[PDB]
Protein backbone atom coordinates (compact mmCIF):
# COMPACT_ATOMS: atom_id res chain seq x y z
CA UNK A 1 0.00 0.00 0.00
CA UNK A 2 1.17 3.53 -0.77
CA UNK A 3 0.44 4.83 2.74
CA UNK A 4 2.33 1.90 4.30
CA UNK A 5 5.22 2.20 1.84
CA UNK A 6 5.33 5.91 2.68
CA UNK A 7 5.24 5.19 6.42
CA UNK A 8 8.26 2.90 6.07
CA UNK A 9 10.06 5.64 4.12
CA UNK A 10 9.13 8.36 6.64
CA UNK A 11 10.62 6.26 9.44
CA UNK A 12 13.72 5.40 7.37
CA UNK A 13 14.22 9.06 6.51
CA UNK A 14 13.81 10.07 10.16
CA UNK A 15 16.43 7.45 11.04
CA UNK A 16 18.95 8.71 8.48
CA UNK A 17 18.40 12.26 9.70
CA UNK A 18 18.60 11.72 13.46
CA UNK A 19 21.37 9.17 13.98
CA UNK A 20 24.95 10.30 13.46
CA UNK A 21 25.99 6.76 12.57
CA UNK A 22 24.17 4.44 10.22
CA UNK A 23 25.11 1.05 8.91
CA UNK A 24 26.15 2.17 5.42
CA UNK A 25 28.44 4.85 6.89
CA UNK A 26 29.78 2.40 9.47
CA UNK A 27 30.58 -0.25 6.85
CA UNK A 28 32.49 2.26 4.73
CA UNK A 29 34.66 3.14 7.73
CA UNK A 30 35.07 -0.49 8.82
CA UNK A 31 36.36 -1.39 5.35
CA UNK A 32 39.19 1.16 5.52
CA UNK A 33 40.57 10.69 9.28
CA UNK A 34 40.83 6.88 9.20
CA UNK A 35 39.87 5.25 12.50
CA UNK A 36 42.57 5.15 15.15
CA UNK A 37 42.86 1.60 16.50
CA UNK A 38 42.66 1.13 20.28
CA UNK A 39 43.99 -2.35 21.00
CA UNK A 40 45.98 -1.92 24.25
CA UNK A 41 46.62 0.56 27.06
CA UNK A 42 49.23 2.53 25.10
CA UNK A 43 46.80 3.14 22.23
CA UNK A 44 43.89 3.80 24.60
CA UNK A 45 45.96 6.59 26.15
CA UNK A 46 46.95 7.94 22.72
CA UNK A 47 43.34 7.96 21.53
CA UNK A 48 42.24 9.71 24.71
CA UNK A 49 44.71 12.55 24.16
CA UNK A 50 43.41 13.09 20.60
CA UNK A 51 39.70 12.22 20.85
CA UNK A 52 38.66 13.04 24.47
CA UNK A 53 41.62 15.14 25.63
CA UNK A 54 39.61 16.75 28.46
CA UNK A 55 39.19 13.41 30.25
CA UNK A 56 42.94 12.72 30.64
CA UNK A 57 44.02 16.33 31.35
CA UNK A 58 44.11 15.85 35.14
CA UNK A 59 47.56 14.29 35.58
CA UNK A 60 47.80 11.77 38.41
CA UNK A 61 44.17 12.67 39.22
CA UNK A 62 42.94 10.81 36.13
CA UNK A 63 40.75 7.78 36.74
CA UNK A 64 41.67 4.14 36.25
CA UNK A 65 41.53 3.17 32.56
CA UNK A 66 38.49 0.93 33.04
CA UNK A 67 36.62 3.80 34.69
CA UNK A 68 37.51 6.26 31.90
CA UNK A 69 36.21 3.74 29.35
CA UNK A 70 33.00 3.28 31.35
CA UNK A 71 32.51 7.06 31.41
CA UNK A 72 33.04 7.31 27.65
CA UNK A 73 30.55 4.48 27.09
CA UNK A 74 27.97 6.38 29.18
CA UNK A 75 28.63 9.56 27.19
CA UNK A 76 27.99 7.58 23.99
CA UNK A 77 24.73 6.27 25.45
CA UNK A 78 23.60 9.77 26.49
CA UNK A 79 24.11 11.04 22.94
CA UNK A 80 22.19 8.08 21.49
CA UNK A 81 19.28 8.71 23.88
CA UNK A 82 19.08 12.28 22.52
CA UNK A 83 19.03 10.99 18.93
CA UNK A 84 16.46 8.33 19.83
CA UNK A 85 14.19 10.92 21.46
CA UNK A 86 14.05 13.04 18.31
CA UNK A 87 13.68 10.01 16.04
CA UNK A 88 10.61 8.90 18.01
CA UNK A 89 8.65 11.89 16.68
CA UNK A 90 8.31 10.37 13.19
CA UNK A 91 6.56 7.27 14.53
CA UNK A 92 2.89 7.96 13.73
CA UNK A 93 0.92 8.66 16.85
CA UNK A 94 3.97 8.94 19.11
CA UNK A 95 3.88 12.74 19.36
CA UNK A 96 0.10 12.43 19.82
CA UNK A 97 0.63 10.28 22.93
CA UNK A 98 0.40 11.61 26.47
CA UNK A 99 3.65 13.28 27.47
CA UNK A 100 4.09 10.83 30.34
CA UNK A 101 3.60 7.83 28.03
CA UNK A 102 6.24 9.16 25.65
CA UNK A 103 8.61 9.21 28.63
CA UNK A 104 7.78 5.63 29.67
CA UNK A 105 8.21 4.23 26.16
CA UNK A 106 11.59 5.90 25.76
CA UNK A 107 12.61 4.85 29.27
CA UNK A 108 12.25 1.11 28.60
CA UNK A 109 13.03 1.28 24.90
CA UNK A 110 16.26 3.29 24.60
CA UNK A 111 18.71 0.62 25.79
CA UNK A 112 17.05 -2.05 23.67
CA UNK A 113 17.42 0.34 20.75
CA UNK A 114 21.01 1.21 21.77
CA UNK A 115 22.15 -2.41 21.76
CA UNK A 116 20.33 -3.18 18.51
CA UNK A 117 21.99 -0.19 16.79
CA UNK A 118 25.42 -0.88 18.35
CA UNK A 119 25.50 -3.95 16.11
CA UNK A 120 25.81 -1.69 13.08
CA UNK A 121 29.23 -0.44 14.28
CA UNK A 122 30.48 -3.84 15.49
CA UNK A 123 32.25 -6.65 13.73
CA UNK A 124 33.78 -9.81 15.21
CA UNK A 125 37.01 -7.93 15.95
CA UNK A 126 35.80 -4.70 17.58
CA UNK A 127 33.66 -1.62 17.17
CA UNK A 128 33.65 1.99 16.03
CA UNK A 129 33.84 4.66 18.74
CA UNK A 130 33.98 8.45 18.98
CA UNK A 131 31.81 9.40 16.02
CA UNK A 132 33.59 6.98 13.70
CA UNK A 133 37.11 8.18 14.51
CA UNK A 134 38.26 5.21 16.60
CA UNK A 135 38.03 1.44 16.46
CA UNK A 136 38.39 -0.38 19.79
CA UNK A 137 39.14 -4.08 19.67
CA UNK A 138 36.89 -6.69 21.17
CA UNK A 139 39.93 -8.41 22.69
CA UNK A 140 41.01 -5.19 24.41
CA UNK A 141 37.53 -4.76 25.90
CA UNK A 142 37.66 -8.39 27.10
CA UNK A 143 41.00 -7.59 28.74
CA UNK A 144 39.59 -4.94 31.10
CA UNK A 145 39.49 -5.95 34.75
CA UNK A 146 36.25 -7.28 36.15
CA UNK A 147 33.55 -6.16 36.25
CA UNK A 148 34.06 -3.73 33.36
CA UNK A 149 34.98 -6.43 30.83
CA UNK A 150 31.64 -8.13 31.51
CA UNK A 151 29.72 -5.10 30.17
CA UNK A 152 31.09 -5.57 26.69
CA UNK A 153 31.11 -9.11 25.41
CA UNK A 154 27.36 -9.93 25.70
CA UNK A 155 26.74 -7.00 23.38
CA UNK A 156 29.15 -8.41 20.79
CA UNK A 157 27.49 -11.83 21.18
CA UNK A 158 24.12 -10.29 20.45
CA UNK A 159 25.47 -8.21 17.58
CA UNK A 160 27.18 -11.05 15.73
CA UNK A 161 23.93 -13.01 15.47
CA UNK A 162 21.96 -9.84 14.71
CA UNK A 163 24.38 -8.86 11.94
CA UNK A 164 24.07 -12.34 10.39
CA UNK A 165 20.48 -11.37 9.52
CA UNK A 166 21.98 -8.84 7.06
CA UNK A 167 19.45 -6.11 7.78
CA UNK A 168 19.90 -2.70 6.24
CA UNK A 169 19.06 0.74 7.59
CA UNK A 170 15.54 0.57 6.09
CA UNK A 171 14.90 -2.56 8.19
CA UNK A 172 16.64 -1.33 11.33
CA UNK A 173 14.77 1.99 11.39
CA UNK A 174 11.45 0.11 11.53
CA UNK A 175 12.81 -2.36 14.10
CA UNK A 176 13.92 0.51 16.35
CA UNK A 177 10.49 2.12 15.92
CA UNK A 178 8.88 -1.20 16.86
CA UNK A 179 11.09 -1.37 19.98
CA UNK A 180 10.02 2.10 21.06
CA UNK A 181 6.28 1.39 20.60
CA UNK A 182 5.90 -1.56 22.98
CA UNK A 183 2.50 -1.49 24.65
CA UNK A 184 3.51 -3.84 27.48
CA UNK A 185 5.93 -1.46 29.21
CA UNK A 186 5.18 -0.94 32.93
CA UNK A 187 3.39 2.24 33.95
CA UNK A 188 1.68 3.17 30.67
CA UNK A 189 -1.43 5.35 30.86
CA UNK A 190 -3.10 4.77 27.46
CA UNK A 191 -2.14 1.16 26.70
CA UNK A 192 -4.83 0.78 24.08
CA UNK A 193 -3.62 3.67 21.95
CA UNK A 194 0.00 2.47 22.18
CA UNK A 195 -0.98 -1.05 21.12
CA UNK A 196 -2.70 0.33 18.03
CA UNK A 197 0.34 2.51 17.30
CA UNK A 198 2.57 -0.56 17.78
CA UNK A 199 0.36 -2.66 15.51
CA UNK A 200 0.71 -0.11 12.71
CA UNK A 201 4.51 -0.03 12.89
CA UNK A 202 4.76 -3.80 13.26
CA UNK A 203 2.41 -4.17 10.28
CA UNK A 204 4.69 -1.94 8.20
CA UNK A 205 7.75 -3.84 9.44
CA UNK A 206 6.29 -7.22 8.45
CA UNK A 207 5.39 -6.01 4.94
CA UNK A 208 8.77 -4.28 4.52
CA UNK A 209 10.69 -7.42 5.48
CA UNK A 210 8.65 -9.47 3.00
CA UNK A 211 9.54 -6.95 0.27
CA UNK A 212 13.18 -6.32 1.20
CA UNK A 213 14.12 -9.89 2.26
CA UNK A 214 12.19 -12.34 0.06
CA UNK A 215 14.88 -14.97 0.68
CA UNK A 216 14.15 -15.33 4.44
CA UNK A 217 10.58 -16.39 5.13
CA UNK A 218 11.17 -16.43 8.91
CA UNK A 219 12.80 -12.99 9.17
CA UNK A 220 9.84 -11.31 10.88
CA UNK A 221 9.52 -13.88 13.72
CA UNK A 222 13.34 -13.89 14.00
CA UNK A 223 13.19 -10.16 14.69
CA UNK A 224 10.34 -10.59 17.18
CA UNK A 225 12.62 -13.00 19.02
CA UNK A 226 15.49 -10.48 18.85
CA UNK A 227 13.23 -7.94 20.57
CA UNK A 228 12.67 -10.40 23.41
CA UNK A 229 16.41 -11.16 23.47
CA UNK A 230 17.15 -7.44 23.75
CA UNK A 231 14.79 -7.07 26.70
CA UNK A 232 16.70 -9.80 28.52
CA UNK A 233 20.02 -8.26 27.49
CA UNK A 234 18.93 -4.97 29.03
CA UNK A 235 17.75 -6.59 32.27
CA UNK A 236 21.14 -8.28 32.57
CA UNK A 237 22.94 -5.05 31.66
CA UNK A 238 21.10 -3.09 34.35
CA UNK A 239 22.08 -5.73 36.92
CA UNK A 240 25.76 -5.42 36.00
CA UNK A 241 25.57 -1.62 36.08
CA UNK A 242 24.12 -1.88 39.60
CA UNK A 243 27.10 -4.03 40.64
CA UNK A 244 29.51 -1.41 39.30
CA UNK A 245 27.65 1.39 41.09
CA UNK A 246 27.85 -0.42 44.43
CA UNK A 247 31.40 -1.77 44.18
CA UNK A 248 33.25 0.91 42.13
CA UNK A 249 33.11 4.28 43.89
CA UNK A 250 34.97 6.00 41.02
CA UNK A 251 32.45 4.99 38.34
CA UNK A 252 29.89 7.78 38.62
CA UNK A 253 26.62 7.25 36.77
CA UNK A 254 25.53 10.05 34.48
CA UNK A 255 22.27 11.54 35.86
CA UNK A 256 20.27 11.01 32.65
CA UNK A 257 21.21 7.34 32.67
CA UNK A 258 20.56 7.19 36.42
CA UNK A 259 16.94 8.23 35.77
CA UNK A 260 16.54 5.72 32.92
CA UNK A 261 17.62 2.87 35.19
CA UNK A 262 15.59 4.14 38.17
CA UNK A 263 12.72 1.72 38.83
CA UNK A 264 13.38 0.03 35.48
CA UNK A 265 13.87 -3.66 36.34
CA UNK B 1 38.39 -31.90 37.91
CA UNK B 2 38.73 -28.22 37.04
CA UNK B 3 39.59 -28.88 33.39
CA UNK B 4 36.60 -31.22 33.02
CA UNK B 5 34.27 -28.85 34.88
CA UNK B 6 35.51 -26.09 32.57
CA UNK B 7 34.99 -28.26 29.49
CA UNK B 8 31.38 -28.85 30.49
CA UNK B 9 30.94 -25.10 30.97
CA UNK B 10 32.61 -24.25 27.64
CA UNK B 11 30.19 -26.57 25.84
CA UNK B 12 27.20 -25.24 27.80
CA UNK B 13 28.21 -21.67 27.03
CA UNK B 14 28.66 -22.50 23.34
CA UNK B 15 25.17 -24.02 23.39
CA UNK B 16 23.55 -20.96 24.98
CA UNK B 17 25.31 -18.74 22.46
CA UNK B 18 24.60 -20.66 19.25
CA UNK B 19 21.03 -21.93 19.60
CA UNK B 20 18.21 -19.41 19.29
CA UNK B 21 15.98 -21.57 21.47
CA UNK B 22 16.96 -23.21 24.71
CA UNK B 23 14.92 -25.12 27.23
CA UNK B 24 14.69 -22.35 29.84
CA UNK B 25 13.48 -19.86 27.20
CA UNK B 26 11.09 -22.44 25.76
CA UNK B 27 9.56 -23.25 29.15
CA UNK B 28 8.95 -19.57 29.88
CA UNK B 29 7.03 -19.25 26.61
CA UNK B 30 5.18 -22.54 27.08
CA UNK B 31 3.94 -21.36 30.49
CA UNK B 32 2.30 -18.24 29.03
CA UNK B 33 4.35 -11.39 21.56
CA UNK B 34 2.66 -14.40 23.19
CA UNK B 35 2.64 -17.48 20.96
CA UNK B 36 -0.12 -17.63 18.36
CA UNK B 37 -1.86 -21.01 18.57
CA UNK B 38 -2.18 -23.03 15.36
CA UNK B 39 -4.79 -25.71 16.03
CA UNK B 40 -6.75 -25.92 12.74
CA UNK B 41 -6.62 -24.79 9.11
CA UNK B 42 -8.11 -21.36 9.85
CA UNK B 43 -5.39 -20.60 12.41
CA UNK B 44 -2.66 -22.14 10.24
CA UNK B 45 -3.63 -19.69 7.50
CA UNK B 46 -3.73 -16.78 9.97
CA UNK B 47 -0.30 -17.65 11.35
CA UNK B 48 1.11 -17.94 7.84
CA UNK B 49 -0.03 -14.41 6.95
CA UNK B 50 1.68 -13.00 10.07
CA UNK B 51 4.74 -15.24 10.52
CA UNK B 52 5.69 -16.45 6.99
CA UNK B 53 3.68 -14.06 4.82
CA UNK B 54 5.89 -14.67 1.76
CA UNK B 55 4.85 -18.33 1.55
CA UNK B 56 1.11 -17.62 1.16
CA UNK B 57 1.42 -14.52 -1.06
CA UNK B 58 0.83 -16.45 -4.31
CA UNK B 59 -2.98 -16.60 -4.37
CA UNK B 60 -4.40 -19.77 -5.91
CA UNK B 61 -0.80 -20.75 -6.71
CA UNK B 62 -0.11 -21.48 -3.03
CA UNK B 63 0.70 -25.07 -2.14
CA UNK B 64 -1.50 -27.53 -0.27
CA UNK B 65 -1.42 -26.86 3.48
CA UNK B 66 0.48 -30.07 4.24
CA UNK B 67 3.15 -29.09 1.72
CA UNK B 68 3.52 -25.57 3.16
CA UNK B 69 3.97 -27.09 6.62
CA UNK B 70 6.57 -29.52 5.27
CA UNK B 71 8.46 -26.61 3.70
CA UNK B 72 8.39 -24.65 6.96
CA UNK B 73 9.65 -27.70 8.85
CA UNK B 74 12.57 -27.99 6.40
CA UNK B 75 13.36 -24.29 6.83
CA UNK B 76 13.46 -24.84 10.60
CA UNK B 77 15.84 -27.77 10.11
CA UNK B 78 18.12 -25.74 7.82
CA UNK B 79 18.45 -23.04 10.47
CA UNK B 80 19.21 -25.61 13.17
CA UNK B 81 21.92 -27.19 10.99
CA UNK B 82 23.58 -23.76 10.77
CA UNK B 83 23.45 -23.36 14.55
CA UNK B 84 24.72 -26.92 15.06
CA UNK B 85 27.66 -26.32 12.72
CA UNK B 86 28.87 -23.31 14.70
CA UNK B 87 28.24 -25.03 18.04
CA UNK B 88 30.47 -27.93 16.99
CA UNK B 89 33.53 -25.66 17.12
CA UNK B 90 33.57 -25.60 20.94
CA UNK B 91 33.88 -29.39 21.16
CA UNK B 92 37.59 -29.90 21.92
CA UNK B 93 39.40 -31.35 18.97
CA UNK B 94 36.50 -30.88 16.55
CA UNK B 95 38.02 -27.89 14.76
CA UNK B 96 41.33 -29.78 14.80
CA UNK B 97 39.76 -32.64 12.81
CA UNK B 98 40.17 -33.09 9.08
CA UNK B 99 37.73 -30.87 7.20
CA UNK B 100 36.14 -33.92 5.57
CA UNK B 101 35.65 -35.64 8.94
CA UNK B 102 33.93 -32.54 10.33
CA UNK B 103 31.51 -32.83 7.40
CA UNK B 104 30.82 -36.53 8.01
CA UNK B 105 30.19 -36.08 11.73
CA UNK B 106 27.75 -33.24 11.11
CA UNK B 107 26.11 -35.16 8.27
CA UNK B 108 25.08 -38.12 10.46
CA UNK B 109 24.74 -36.15 13.68
CA UNK B 110 22.56 -33.13 12.84
CA UNK B 111 19.18 -34.89 12.65
CA UNK B 112 19.87 -36.85 15.82
CA UNK B 113 20.70 -33.53 17.45
CA UNK B 114 17.64 -31.86 15.85
CA UNK B 115 15.21 -34.41 17.26
CA UNK B 116 16.87 -34.40 20.68
CA UNK B 117 16.63 -30.59 20.87
CA UNK B 118 13.08 -30.49 19.44
CA UNK B 119 12.02 -32.08 22.73
CA UNK B 120 12.87 -28.83 24.52
CA UNK B 121 10.10 -26.99 22.62
CA UNK B 122 7.54 -29.83 22.81
CA UNK B 123 4.99 -30.74 25.42
CA UNK B 124 2.25 -33.38 25.25
CA UNK B 125 -0.08 -30.90 23.52
CA UNK B 126 2.13 -29.36 20.82
CA UNK B 127 5.32 -27.46 20.10
CA UNK B 128 6.81 -24.02 19.64
CA UNK B 129 7.42 -22.85 16.06
CA UNK B 130 8.72 -19.76 14.27
CA UNK B 131 11.34 -18.59 16.75
CA UNK B 132 8.97 -18.95 19.70
CA UNK B 133 6.12 -16.95 18.16
CA UNK B 134 3.75 -19.83 17.40
CA UNK B 135 2.53 -22.97 19.10
CA UNK B 136 1.22 -25.71 16.81
CA UNK B 137 -0.88 -28.44 18.37
CA UNK B 138 0.06 -32.07 18.29
CA UNK B 139 -3.52 -32.96 17.35
CA UNK B 140 -3.43 -30.60 14.37
CA UNK B 141 -0.20 -32.19 13.15
CA UNK B 142 -1.80 -35.63 13.55
CA UNK B 143 -4.72 -34.37 11.44
CA UNK B 144 -2.60 -33.70 8.32
CA UNK B 145 -3.22 -36.07 5.45
CA UNK B 146 -0.87 -38.99 5.00
CA UNK B 147 2.03 -39.14 4.69
CA UNK B 148 2.74 -35.75 6.25
CA UNK B 149 1.08 -36.58 9.59
CA UNK B 150 3.45 -39.54 9.96
CA UNK B 151 6.49 -37.22 10.09
CA UNK B 152 5.35 -35.64 13.32
CA UNK B 153 4.09 -38.04 15.94
CA UNK B 154 7.19 -40.27 16.34
CA UNK B 155 9.09 -37.12 17.29
CA UNK B 156 6.56 -36.29 20.01
CA UNK B 157 6.74 -39.92 21.21
CA UNK B 158 10.50 -39.63 21.53
CA UNK B 159 10.30 -36.22 23.16
CA UNK B 160 7.80 -37.15 25.86
CA UNK B 161 10.07 -39.89 27.19
CA UNK B 162 13.16 -37.71 26.73
CA UNK B 163 11.54 -34.83 28.63
CA UNK B 164 10.63 -37.19 31.50
CA UNK B 165 14.38 -37.41 32.19
CA UNK B 166 14.17 -33.72 33.25
CA UNK B 167 17.48 -32.73 31.70
CA UNK B 168 18.51 -29.10 31.64
CA UNK B 169 20.48 -27.14 29.07
CA UNK B 170 23.78 -28.01 30.81
CA UNK B 171 22.99 -31.71 30.25
CA UNK B 172 21.59 -31.32 26.74
CA UNK B 173 24.58 -29.32 25.48
CA UNK B 174 26.90 -32.20 26.42
CA UNK B 175 24.48 -34.78 24.99
CA UNK B 176 24.36 -32.92 21.66
CA UNK B 177 28.17 -32.71 21.69
CA UNK B 178 28.30 -36.47 22.35
CA UNK B 179 25.94 -37.05 19.40
CA UNK B 180 28.16 -35.04 17.08
CA UNK B 181 31.36 -36.86 18.11
CA UNK B 182 30.38 -40.43 17.21
CA UNK B 183 33.38 -42.36 15.96
CA UNK B 184 31.31 -45.08 14.28
CA UNK B 185 29.85 -42.91 11.51
CA UNK B 186 30.42 -44.30 8.00
CA UNK B 187 33.19 -42.78 5.91
CA UNK B 188 35.40 -41.31 8.64
CA UNK B 189 39.09 -40.77 7.84
CA UNK B 190 40.68 -40.49 11.31
CA UNK B 191 38.49 -42.79 13.40
CA UNK B 192 41.05 -43.05 16.17
CA UNK B 193 41.23 -39.32 16.80
CA UNK B 194 37.42 -39.02 16.78
CA UNK B 195 37.06 -41.87 19.27
CA UNK B 196 39.44 -40.11 21.65
CA UNK B 197 37.54 -36.84 21.15
CA UNK B 198 34.28 -38.73 21.79
CA UNK B 199 35.70 -40.38 24.91
CA UNK B 200 36.59 -36.98 26.36
CA UNK B 201 33.12 -35.53 25.84
CA UNK B 202 31.41 -38.70 27.04
CA UNK B 203 33.68 -38.68 30.10
CA UNK B 204 32.63 -35.10 30.87
CA UNK B 205 28.97 -36.02 30.26
CA UNK B 206 29.12 -38.96 32.69
CA UNK B 207 30.70 -36.85 35.44
CA UNK B 208 28.30 -33.96 34.81
CA UNK B 209 25.24 -36.21 35.08
CA UNK B 210 26.55 -37.66 38.35
CA UNK B 211 26.94 -34.11 39.70
CA UNK B 212 23.75 -32.59 38.29
CA UNK B 213 21.42 -35.61 38.72
CA UNK B 214 22.45 -37.47 41.90
CA UNK B 215 18.92 -38.87 42.18
CA UNK B 216 19.12 -41.00 38.99
CA UNK B 217 21.95 -43.53 39.11
CA UNK B 218 21.06 -44.90 35.65
CA UNK B 219 20.86 -41.53 33.85
CA UNK B 220 24.07 -41.99 31.86
CA UNK B 221 23.14 -45.41 30.38
CA UNK B 222 19.59 -44.07 29.80
CA UNK B 223 21.10 -41.33 27.64
CA UNK B 224 23.34 -43.80 25.81
CA UNK B 225 20.16 -45.68 24.94
CA UNK B 226 18.50 -42.43 23.81
CA UNK B 227 21.41 -41.91 21.39
CA UNK B 228 20.73 -45.32 19.88
CA UNK B 229 16.99 -44.54 19.82
CA UNK B 230 17.72 -41.31 17.96
CA UNK B 231 19.77 -43.13 15.34
CA UNK B 232 16.81 -45.40 14.65
CA UNK B 233 14.43 -42.43 14.67
CA UNK B 234 16.57 -40.76 12.00
CA UNK B 235 16.75 -43.89 9.83
CA UNK B 236 12.96 -44.11 9.97
CA UNK B 237 12.62 -40.38 9.30
CA UNK B 238 14.83 -40.58 6.22
CA UNK B 239 12.70 -43.44 4.89
CA UNK B 240 9.51 -41.41 5.28
CA UNK B 241 11.13 -38.37 3.65
CA UNK B 242 12.05 -40.59 0.70
CA UNK B 243 8.41 -41.66 0.38
CA UNK B 244 7.30 -38.02 0.31
CA UNK B 245 9.93 -37.16 -2.31
CA UNK B 246 8.77 -39.95 -4.61
CA UNK B 247 5.01 -39.61 -4.14
CA UNK B 248 4.51 -35.84 -3.54
CA UNK B 249 5.77 -33.83 -6.52
CA UNK B 250 4.96 -30.51 -4.79
CA UNK B 251 7.13 -31.21 -1.72
CA UNK B 252 10.52 -30.00 -2.91
CA UNK B 253 13.49 -30.93 -0.73
CA UNK B 254 15.77 -28.08 0.29
CA UNK B 255 19.21 -28.67 -1.30
CA UNK B 256 21.13 -28.54 2.00
CA UNK B 257 18.86 -31.22 3.42
CA UNK B 258 19.08 -33.14 0.14
CA UNK B 259 22.85 -33.40 0.61
CA UNK B 260 22.51 -34.45 4.27
CA UNK B 261 20.23 -37.33 3.29
CA UNK B 262 22.33 -38.28 0.25
CA UNK B 263 23.99 -41.65 0.89
CA UNK B 264 23.02 -41.42 4.57
CA UNK B 265 21.08 -44.64 5.27
C1 LIG C 1 28.51 2.07 30.46
C2 LIG C 1 27.84 1.07 29.54
C3 LIG C 1 26.76 1.68 28.63
C4 LIG C 1 26.20 0.67 27.63
C5 LIG C 1 27.22 0.11 26.67
C6 LIG C 1 27.50 -1.24 26.65
C7 LIG C 1 28.42 -1.78 25.77
C8 LIG C 1 29.08 -0.95 24.87
O1 LIG C 1 29.99 -1.41 23.96
C9 LIG C 1 30.27 -2.80 23.96
C10 LIG C 1 28.80 0.44 24.86
C11 LIG C 1 29.45 1.43 23.96
O2 LIG C 1 29.05 2.59 23.94
N1 LIG C 1 30.47 1.03 23.20
C12 LIG C 1 31.23 1.98 22.39
C13 LIG C 1 32.37 2.59 23.15
C14 LIG C 1 33.39 1.79 23.64
C15 LIG C 1 34.46 2.33 24.33
C16 LIG C 1 34.52 3.69 24.52
O3 LIG C 1 35.58 4.22 25.23
C17 LIG C 1 36.49 5.06 24.59
C18 LIG C 1 37.49 5.60 25.37
C19 LIG C 1 38.43 6.43 24.79
C20 LIG C 1 38.35 6.68 23.46
F1 LIG C 1 39.28 7.51 22.89
C21 LIG C 1 37.37 6.16 22.66
C22 LIG C 1 36.43 5.32 23.24
C23 LIG C 1 33.50 4.49 24.05
F2 LIG C 1 33.57 5.82 24.26
C24 LIG C 1 32.43 3.96 23.36
C25 LIG C 1 27.87 0.94 25.77
C26 LIG C 1 25.59 2.28 29.42
O4 LIG C 1 25.12 1.63 30.38
O5 LIG C 1 25.11 3.36 29.02
C1 LIG D 1 10.32 -31.87 6.97
C2 LIG D 1 10.63 -32.58 8.27
C3 LIG D 1 11.94 -32.11 8.94
C4 LIG D 1 12.15 -32.75 10.31
C5 LIG D 1 11.08 -32.42 11.32
C6 LIG D 1 10.31 -33.43 11.88
C7 LIG D 1 9.33 -33.15 12.82
C8 LIG D 1 9.12 -31.84 13.23
O1 LIG D 1 8.19 -31.50 14.17
C9 LIG D 1 7.40 -32.54 14.73
C10 LIG D 1 9.91 -30.80 12.69
C11 LIG D 1 9.77 -29.36 13.05
O2 LIG D 1 10.58 -28.54 12.62
N1 LIG D 1 8.74 -28.99 13.82
C12 LIG D 1 8.48 -27.58 14.09
C13 LIG D 1 7.59 -26.95 13.05
C14 LIG D 1 6.31 -27.42 12.85
C15 LIG D 1 5.48 -26.85 11.91
C16 LIG D 1 5.92 -25.78 11.16
O3 LIG D 1 5.09 -25.23 10.21
C17 LIG D 1 4.62 -23.93 10.37
C18 LIG D 1 3.84 -23.42 9.35
C19 LIG D 1 3.35 -22.14 9.45
C20 LIG D 1 3.63 -21.41 10.56
F1 LIG D 1 3.14 -20.14 10.65
C21 LIG D 1 4.40 -21.88 11.58
C22 LIG D 1 4.90 -23.17 11.49
C23 LIG D 1 7.20 -25.32 11.35
F2 LIG D 1 7.63 -24.27 10.61
C24 LIG D 1 8.05 -25.87 12.29
C25 LIG D 1 10.88 -31.12 11.75
C26 LIG D 1 13.18 -32.39 8.08
O4 LIG D 1 13.27 -33.50 7.51
O5 LIG D 1 14.06 -31.52 8.04
Amino acid sequence: TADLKSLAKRIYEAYLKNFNMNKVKARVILSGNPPFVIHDMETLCMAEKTLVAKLVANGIQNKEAEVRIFHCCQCTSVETVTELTEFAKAIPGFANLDLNDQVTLLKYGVYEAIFAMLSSVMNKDGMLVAYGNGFITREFLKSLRKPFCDIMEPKFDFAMKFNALELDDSDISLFVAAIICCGDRPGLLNVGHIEKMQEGIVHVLRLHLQSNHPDDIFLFPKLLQKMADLRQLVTEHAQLVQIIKKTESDAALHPLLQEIYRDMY
Side-chain angles (χ1 to χ4, degrees), chain A residues 169-239:
Chain A
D169 293 306
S170 76
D171 311 313
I172 295 162
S173 60
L174 287 171
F175 183 74
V176 172
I179 286 170
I180 292 172
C181 303
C182 282
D184 71 338
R185 309 300 195 183
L188 289 176
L189 295 169
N190 305 89
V191 172
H193 287 177
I194 298 166
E195 293 179 342
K196 304 282 176 164
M197 174 190 60
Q198 170 177 35
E199 182 181 1
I201 292 134
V202 174
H203 184 38
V204 170
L205 168 70
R206 184 172 63 248
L207 297 182
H208 181 82
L209 293 175
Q210 175 176 3
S211 176
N212 196 38
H213 294 270
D215 48 319
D216 189 346
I217 64 167
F218 280 141
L219 190 52
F220 175 67
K222 288 175 179 182
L223 284 179
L224 292 181
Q225 177 184 67
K226 299 297 185 202
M227 296 179 59
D229 291 346
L230 281 163
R231 196 174 282 197
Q232 186 62 27
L233 195 71
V234 171
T235 299
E236 293 169 348
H237 181 72
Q239 292 181 306

Side-chain angles (χ1 to χ4, degrees), chain A residues 5 11 54 57 70 72 99 131 178 182 188 201 213 226-227:
Chain A
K5 278 266 297 173
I11 286 169
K54 164 128 291 240
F70 189 79
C72 288
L99 297 174
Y131 292 86
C182 282
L188 289 176
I201 292 134
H213 294 270
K226 299 297 185 202
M227 296 179 59

Side-chain angles (χ1 to χ4, degrees), chain A residues 23-32 34-59 62-93:
Chain A
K23 179 162 188 181
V24 161
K25 186 189 293 195
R27 284 182 150 185
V28 165
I29 297 166
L30 284 175
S31 75
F36 181 82
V37 168
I38 302 160
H39 63 91
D40 67 358
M41 286 302 168
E42 179 184 42
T43 51
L44 172 72
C45 290
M46 289 167 67
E48 288 177 320
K49 298 193 186 305
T50 299
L51 302 170
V52 283
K54 164 128 291 240
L55 197 65
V56 293
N58 315 271
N62 286 332
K63 306 295 186 60
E64 191 178 345
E66 284 84 351
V67 176
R68 310 195 300 263
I69 286 169
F70 189 79
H71 178 81
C72 288
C73 290
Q74 294 183 70
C75 291
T76 306
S77 295
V78 163
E79 301 286 5
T80 308
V81 168
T82 300
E83 303 179 330
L84 276 159
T85 300
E86 180 77 10
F87 170 69
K89 304 192 182 159
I91 286 151

